Design an enzyme around this catalytic site. Structure first.
Site, PDB file in Angstrom:
ATOM      1  N   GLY A  49      26.351  35.324 -53.761  1.00  0.00           N
ATOM      2  CA  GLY A  49      25.390  36.082 -52.986  1.00  0.00           C
ATOM      3  C   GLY A  49      24.127  36.104 -53.817  1.00  0.00           C
ATOM      4  O   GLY A  49      23.283  35.227 -53.645  1.00  0.00           O
ATOM      5  N   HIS A  97      26.548  30.050 -62.035  1.00  0.00           N
ATOM      6  CA  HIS A  97      25.362  29.599 -61.328  1.00  0.00           C
ATOM      7  C   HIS A  97      24.177  30.503 -61.647  1.00  0.00           C
ATOM      8  O   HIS A  97      23.041  30.053 -61.688  1.00  0.00           O
ATOM      9  CB  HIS A  97      25.621  29.577 -59.819  1.00  0.00           C
ATOM     10  CG  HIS A  97      24.574  28.847 -59.038  1.00  0.00           C
ATOM     11  ND1 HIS A  97      23.755  29.474 -58.125  1.00  0.00           N
ATOM     12  CD2 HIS A  97      24.215  27.542 -59.032  1.00  0.00           C
ATOM     13  CE1 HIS A  97      22.937  28.586 -57.587  1.00  0.00           C
ATOM     14  NE2 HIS A  97      23.196  27.406 -58.120  1.00  0.00           N
ATOM     15  N   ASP A  98      24.435  31.783 -61.869  1.00  0.00           N
ATOM     16  CA  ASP A  98      23.349  32.695 -62.203  1.00  0.00           C
ATOM     17  C   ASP A  98      22.826  32.400 -63.595  1.00  0.00           C
ATOM     18  O   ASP A  98      21.623  32.213 -63.770  1.00  0.00           O
ATOM     19  CB  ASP A  98      23.818  34.139 -62.131  1.00  0.00           C
ATOM     20  CG  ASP A  98      23.945  34.620 -60.720  1.00  0.00           C
ATOM     21  OD1 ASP A  98      24.158  33.764 -59.832  1.00  0.00           O
ATOM     22  OD2 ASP A  98      23.844  35.849 -60.502  1.00  0.00           O
ATOM     23  N   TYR A 139      13.578  20.099 -55.320  1.00  0.00           N
ATOM     24  CA  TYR A 139      13.932  18.986 -56.174  1.00  0.00           C
ATOM     25  C   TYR A 139      14.299  17.784 -55.326  1.00  0.00           C
ATOM     26  O   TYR A 139      14.250  17.847 -54.097  1.00  0.00           O
ATOM     27  CB  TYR A 139      15.096  19.374 -57.088  1.00  0.00           C
ATOM     28  CG  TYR A 139      16.234  20.083 -56.394  1.00  0.00           C
ATOM     29  CD1 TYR A 139      17.049  19.418 -55.475  1.00  0.00           C
ATOM     30  CD2 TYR A 139      16.513  21.416 -56.677  1.00  0.00           C
ATOM     31  CE1 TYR A 139      18.120  20.066 -54.863  1.00  0.00           C
ATOM     32  CE2 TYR A 139      17.579  22.071 -56.073  1.00  0.00           C
ATOM     33  CZ  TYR A 139      18.379  21.391 -55.172  1.00  0.00           C
ATOM     34  OH  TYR A 139      19.455  22.029 -54.614  1.00  0.00           O
ATOM     35  N   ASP A 143      22.600  23.771 -59.057  1.00  0.00           N
ATOM     36  CA  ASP A 143      23.126  23.776 -57.710  1.00  0.00           C
ATOM     37  C   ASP A 143      24.212  22.736 -57.604  1.00  0.00           C
ATOM     38  O   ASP A 143      25.293  22.995 -57.066  1.00  0.00           O
ATOM     39  CB  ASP A 143      22.025  23.456 -56.695  1.00  0.00           C
ATOM     40  CG  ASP A 143      20.980  24.548 -56.585  1.00  0.00           C
ATOM     41  OD1 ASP A 143      21.354  25.735 -56.569  1.00  0.00           O
ATOM     42  OD2 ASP A 143      19.780  24.217 -56.488  1.00  0.00           O
ATOM     43  N   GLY A 176      22.816  39.158 -56.904  1.00  0.00           N
ATOM     44  CA  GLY A 176      23.023  39.921 -58.129  1.00  0.00           C
ATOM     45  C   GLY A 176      24.473  40.148 -58.547  1.00  0.00           C
ATOM     46  O   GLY A 176      25.272  40.709 -57.796  1.00  0.00           O
ATOM     47  N   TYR A 183      20.547  29.657 -63.663  1.00  0.00           N
ATOM     48  CA  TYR A 183      19.203  29.944 -63.213  1.00  0.00           C
ATOM     49  C   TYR A 183      18.440  30.722 -64.261  1.00  0.00           C
ATOM     50  O   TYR A 183      17.261  30.467 -64.484  1.00  0.00           O
ATOM     51  CB  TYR A 183      19.231  30.726 -61.907  1.00  0.00           C
ATOM     52  CG  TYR A 183      19.335  29.844 -60.685  1.00  0.00           C
ATOM     53  CD1 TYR A 183      19.541  28.467 -60.805  1.00  0.00           C
ATOM     54  CD2 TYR A 183      19.258  30.390 -59.411  1.00  0.00           C
ATOM     55  CE1 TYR A 183      19.676  27.657 -59.680  1.00  0.00           C
ATOM     56  CE2 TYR A 183      19.392  29.592 -58.281  1.00  0.00           C
ATOM     57  CZ  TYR A 183      19.604  28.228 -58.421  1.00  0.00           C
ATOM     58  OH  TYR A 183      19.777  27.448 -57.304  1.00  0.00           O
ATOM     59  N   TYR A 204      29.692  38.145 -57.925  1.00  0.00           N
ATOM     60  CA  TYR A 204      28.545  37.355 -58.292  1.00  0.00           C
ATOM     61  C   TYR A 204      27.976  36.410 -57.254  1.00  0.00           C
ATOM     62  O   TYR A 204      26.808  36.046 -57.353  1.00  0.00           O
ATOM     63  CB  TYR A 204      28.844  36.603 -59.589  1.00  0.00           C
ATOM     64  CG  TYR A 204      28.959  37.531 -60.771  1.00  0.00           C
ATOM     65  CD1 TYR A 204      30.087  38.334 -60.949  1.00  0.00           C
ATOM     66  CD2 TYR A 204      27.904  37.669 -61.667  1.00  0.00           C
ATOM     67  CE1 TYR A 204      30.155  39.258 -61.987  1.00  0.00           C
ATOM     68  CE2 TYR A 204      27.961  38.590 -62.712  1.00  0.00           C
ATOM     69  CZ  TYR A 204      29.087  39.387 -62.862  1.00  0.00           C
ATOM     70  OH  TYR A 204      29.127  40.350 -63.849  1.00  0.00           O
TER      71      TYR A 204
END
Ligand SMILES: [Zn+2]
Lengths: 119, 119
Positions: free
Chosen positions: A29, A47-48, A67, A93, A31, A51, A27
């Site tokens: 990187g 983290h994905d 941000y 993040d 995709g 998002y 995961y």
């Protein structure tokens, strides 16, 4: 802001570069697919999802949204002057960098064959 | 969407599993940065930029968006029955897939060490 996310990782794991996370596990990187393979990797998967959530916000582009935050002696803080989108992304993040600095880095997990590891 | 995009790749590159393009060069599969290493990797760069241009449209997310396309014989076609977003995302995938059919595949450029090769 993919760039600010790089600064964060440095603000918590000075001993490495984002590149070490650019291609790690299934995961990190970009995709994801398959089983996290690792706690560190599990961080990236989360983290994905983060998002994916932040993307529900109207026109919110996690990758390009700039941000506001500050890194002081290892400490990450998302400031208030952000709006809904910036605020959400900053937090993603921010939590990833902490999750990163907390998990062990397994060199055997750098550059693996996604074809025979993440199915 | 991705399932559509990868079904396209299966259309014009039957002798190769889509996973082969999931970690190729500095731009195929992953997020992308640095200089392409070959025509194929370059194809992916153009696909990246294409998608970033598709985000310029309100509530348009290439990855999750569904469109109508046909893969007949070796021909790809995006149906007129497509709104703006779908119509652009589809066209992106179509051009990407066609680019994949012509570009030569180099194994040395598969699952490469990004930190050392892209920058
Ligand atoms: Zn790789």
């Amino acid at each position: 802001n993919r760039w600010q996310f790089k600064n964060m990782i440095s603000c918590t794991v000075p001993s490495r570069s984002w590149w070490d996370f650019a291609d790690y596990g299934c995961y990190c990187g970009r995709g994801g697919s398959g089983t996290p393979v690792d706690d560190l990797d599990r961080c990236c998967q989360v983290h994905d999802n983060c998002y994916n959530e932040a993307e529900k916000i109207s026109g919110c582009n996690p990758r390009f949204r700039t941000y506001s935050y500050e890194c002081t002696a290892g400490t990450l803080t998302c400031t208030g002057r952000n709006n809904a989108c910036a605020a959400s992304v900053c937090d993603c993040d921010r939590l990833a960098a902490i999750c990163f600095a907390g998990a062990p880095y397994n060199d055997n997990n750098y550059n693996i064959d996604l074809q025979a590891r993440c199915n | 969407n991705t399932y559509q995009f990868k079904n396209m790749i299966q259309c014009t590159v039957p002798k190769r599993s889509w996973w082969d393009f999931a970690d190729y060069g500095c731009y195929c599969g992953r997020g992308g940065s640095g200089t392409p290493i070959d025509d194929l990797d370059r194809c992916c760069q153009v696909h990246d930029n294409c998608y970033n241009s598709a985000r310029e449209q309100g509530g348009c997310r290439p990855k999750q968006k569904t469109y109508s396309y046909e893969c007949k014989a070796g021909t790809l076609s995006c149906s007129g029955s497509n709104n703006s977003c779908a119509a652009t995302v589809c066209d992106c995938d179509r051009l990407a897939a066609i680019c994949f059919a012509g570009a030569p595949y180099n194994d040395n450029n598969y699952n490469i060490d990004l930190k050392a090769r892209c920058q």
